[PDB]
């Protein structure tokens, strides 16, 4: 289906404990493929998926140099942000940034992204036009004016529409046997008595990729959103994901409940019931 390449940058100051750590991780969809960590003994862009390993030394050298420079740029940015908020040198602060591109099934650009947060709060974002910024507050307006003066949006647009999508398409081809393979969930319903009066029905989805899934319970054909406990989709550690949805049902009424599953790997959406 559709695909994305995204880089996730986290920089965290730690006064009294050295300079801020910078870590970058790169993903195609739900698959991490690179990391860089300034706290590594020998910081370097490192492969984290088999299909990226074939890239030549120029790829690793260029990304390592970009990331080493980024460590310094983010440290400067953290110093600037501390000043923009009149903050003390005593406290720890976090600067997060995510950027990258989305393509459709035809490989054509859907949209680009460049968004940042300071201490977990949205700070500045490149708008979908790839030409203007949205600043959260008067501090972020300083960054906006600085990026407007330096024509940063134009540089990001050129990257997002060219380099980013070209590399995403290349990764999708090199890793096609995994990145372009949707693995359906293995599904089943379990039954867990609570009392004489009620039991839990839990609908499981295991072994699926990518993480996007719809997993719901209906009673008599009516969706039970408020009454369903739906856990966050969680990684299994073998590239796949897991999820479950549970409802509390009165004893003897189990057959009024149906679990519904949709996922890209399924030839058809599933309907399941408890099968005692």
């Amino acid at each position: 289906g559709s695909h994305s390449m995204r880089y996730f940058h986290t920089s965290v100051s730690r006064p009294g404990r050295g300079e801020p750590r910078f870590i970058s991780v790169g993903y195609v969809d739900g698959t991490q493929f690179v990391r860089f960590d300034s706290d590594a003994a020998s910081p370097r862009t490192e492969p984290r998926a088999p299909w990226i390993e074939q890239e030549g030394p120029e790829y690793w050298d260029r990304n390592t140099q970009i990331s080493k420079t980024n460590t310094q740029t983010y440290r400067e940015s953290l110093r600037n942000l501390r000043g923009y908020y009149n903050q003390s040198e005593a406290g720890s602060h976090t600067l997060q940034r995510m950027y990258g591109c989305d393509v459709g099934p035809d490989g054509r650009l859907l949209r680009g992204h460049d968004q940042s947060a300071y201490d977990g709060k949205d700070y500045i974002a490149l708008n979908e036009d790839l030409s203007s910024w949205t600043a959260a507050d008067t501090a972020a307006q300083i960054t906006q004016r600085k990026w407007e003066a330096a024509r940063v949006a134009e540089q990001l647009r050129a990257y997002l529409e060219g380099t980013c999508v070209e590399w995403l398409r290349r990764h999708l081809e090199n890793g096609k046997e995994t990145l372009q393979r949707a693995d359906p969930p293995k599904t089943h319903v379990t039954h867990h008595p609570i009392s004489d009066h009620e039991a839990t029905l839990r609908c499981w989805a295991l072994g699926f990729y990518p993480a996007e899934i719809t997993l719901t319970w209906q009673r008599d054909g009516e969706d039970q959103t408020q009454d369903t406990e739906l856990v966050e989709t969680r990684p299994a550690g073998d590239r796949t994901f897991q999820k479950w949805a549970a409802v509390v049902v009165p004893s003897g009424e189990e057959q009024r409940y149906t679990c519904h599953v949709q996922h890209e790997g399924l030839p058809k959406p599933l309907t399941l019931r408890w099968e005692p």
């Binding site: 970058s24 940042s116 980013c164």
Partner: peptide, 8 residues
């Protein structure tokens, strides 16, 4: 490939 970050 990544892009350079821009100073905030």
């Amino acid at each position: 490939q990544e892009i350079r970050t821009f100073s905030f």
